[model samples]
Target: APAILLVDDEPHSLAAMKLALEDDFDVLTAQGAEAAIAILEEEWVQVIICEQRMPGRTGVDFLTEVRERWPETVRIIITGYTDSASMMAAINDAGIHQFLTKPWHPEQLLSSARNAARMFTLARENERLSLEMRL
Candidate 1:
């Protein structure tokens, strides 16, 4: 199964999001961007769904770094605050796959995650095929 890392400053938010996604994905939770980064170093995550606001680094900031470092990972931004800056950053700056509004429906999150996992898998396979062609 593809992996998903959820980043949120709130512990309960992380816990609830984990439970919401547990049955559908191999879910991992990080309380902040720093912790999330540490987890990312060790985890081969396919989908990264993170809250927009955090203590030191915003989710967009962290995910933007992920975009450069791990472009294969599908980035999803979930936010309770409705601000243009965050939305614009997710779309233009970070190459986010989805911008999800918080108080998200479980089905919506599940579906988005499932789609991202499939997308990552397909992209990986395509790269593998390209490598095989080269050889």
Candidate 2:
């Protein structure tokens, strides 16, 4: 099963996502962006789903850092509102794979998660091949 790194400050939101996707993915929850990065250091994550609003760092900021540090990880942002221009900019600049709004339907979220997982797998394989070619 693909490993999903879910980062959210809210406990309920994390729990909900875990319950919705646990059957299909090995879900790992992080309370904040720092914890998520810690997990990334030791684990191979297929997908990252992050909430847009947090205390210190927004989801986009966090994922943008992820893109720089771990280019192979597939990134997704979950936001409650569509009115933020900054969030929109980050989504595009950070190479986000999907934007899932708050109050997302289970089916849609599941589908998006699956798609991100597949994308991550393909990207990792491509990186492997590129390394092999270099060798």
Candidate 3:
């Protein structure tokens, strides 16, 4: 199964996402970016969904750091309506694959997760092929 890292300061939000996607993915929850980064160092995560507002670090900052450290992991940002500009900037700067607004439907979240997993699989395969070509 593919792994997904969910980063949020809110325990309820993290719990909700876990309940929503646990059946379909090997979901890991982190209270903040630092924890998420520590997990990334020890595990292979296919995708990451991070909330925009956190006590220590914003989601954009976290995603940007993830992009720099682990380019293979697909990054997604979740934000409320008020944070659209910051989310958009993160999307452009961090190469975020998707954005989910707060109050997201479970079905939509599942759908996006499936799509992101597929994309990560394809990216890995493509990288393998490129390496073979170089060889």
Candidate 4:
């Protein structure tokens, strides 16, 4: 199964998101960007769902780094606060694929995860085909 990494400082939030995604994806949980980076280094993650507020780094900042290091992984941000000017700009700058506020429906999260994983699969396949053709 395609793996999805869920980043949240709170265990409860992580648990809920994992429950929502685990049926379809091999879900991996991280407490923050640092932990997520560790997981990324060792695991094969097709998508990321991260909370915006954390102890040290914001979700946008983390995802931005992920964009540079693992561009193929789909990045999504979840926040409790409503949209702000700076946040909106940061999200855009980060190249995040999607953003959802807290209290998101389980079905919504599931659908988004499915779409993201599908995109990852197609992108990797495309890369493989290109390499094969080049050979």
Candidate 5:
């Protein structure tokens, strides 16, 4: 199963996401960016779903940092409201694959995770093929 990291300040949110994703993925939950960064150091997480509002670092800020360090990792942000500025930052700076509105359904989460996982796999395979061609 693909490894997916869930970063949210709310415990219930983390638990719910875990419950929804655990069947198809190795779900890892973090309370905030600090724990998430540490996990990323030790784990090869393929997809990340982060809440837009966090205690210290907003999801865009965190994901933008991740884009610099872990460029291949897929990013998704969950926001309660839509603000074009935030959305622009998420899409342009963070390079998120998708953004889900609040009150997302389990099936929506599952499908998004599934697609993100596949995107990760496809990107890896593309790199492998390029390397083979070079060889």
Candidate 6:
């Protein structure tokens, strides 16, 4: 099954998301980026939904490292603040595919995860097709 990692400083948010997503996909929760890193180390995570504002190394900071290390993993962010310009820049820099603002819609969150999983599948398919064609 496709897997996703949910990262937020608030434990409630992680729990809520887990409830919403557990049936559709394998879910992993992390309280912060540090905890997220540990999970990423051992899990075959295919997508990520990381809250933008955390205690240390904001979502962007962590996602940047994730991009460098696991470029195939789909990335998303959750935000409560209106730091629009900077947030957009960070999203671009970190290769984030979606942003879920505060009071996020659960349906949208679920949709994003499903979309991310499909994206990963499509990407790998494309790579395989290209390599086969080159042979």
Please give the CA lDDT of all the candidate structures: 0.88, 0.89, 0.88, 0.91, 0.88, 0.88
lDDT of 5 by residue, 1-135 (tens): 558999998989999988899999999999999899999998889999999888888888888889899988999998776577856655676578888988889999999999999999999899999999999
Candidate 1 weakest lDDT stretch, 10 residues: 85-94
Cα lDDT tens digits, model 2, 38-110, are 9988798889999988889889899988999888889999978756787688678878889889998889999
> Which residues of candidate 3, in runs, are more than 4 Å off?
84-86
Kindly list the per-residue Cα lDDT of model 3 for residues 24-124, writing each as its tens digit. 99999999989999999999899999998888888888988888998989988886657556557657887889988999889899889889999999999
Candidate 2 Cα deviation (angstroms), residue 14: 0.3
Writing each residue's lDDT as its tens digit, candidate 6 over 1-135 gives 758999999999999998889989889999999999999888789899999889868999999999898888988988888877977887887678888788777888898889989999899788899999999
| Candidate 5 lDDT for residue 54 | 88
Write down the RMSD of candidate 3 (Cα, Å).
Answer: 1.3
Model 6: lDDT to the true structure: 0.88
Which residue pairs in candidate 4 collide? none
Model 4 residue 7 CA deviation (Å) reads 0.1
- In candidate 2, stretches whose alpha carbon ends up further than 4 angstroms from where it belongs are 133-135
Alpha-carbon error at 128 in model 2, in Å?
3.0
Per-prediction TM-score: 0.92, 0.90, 0.93, 0.94, 0.93, 0.93
Q: In model 2, state the lDDT of residue 125.
A: 92
User: Candidates 1 and 6: which is better by TM-score?
Assistant: 6
Top candidate by TM-score: 4
Best by lDDT: 4
Better of 1 and 2 by TM-score: 1
Each model's backbone clash number: 0, 0, 0, 0, 0, 0
What alpha-carbon RMSD in Å does predicted model 4 have with respect to the real structure?
1.2
Q: Candidate 3, which ten residues in sequence have the lowest lDDT sum? A: 81-90
Answer with 1 or 4, whichever has the higher TM-score: 4
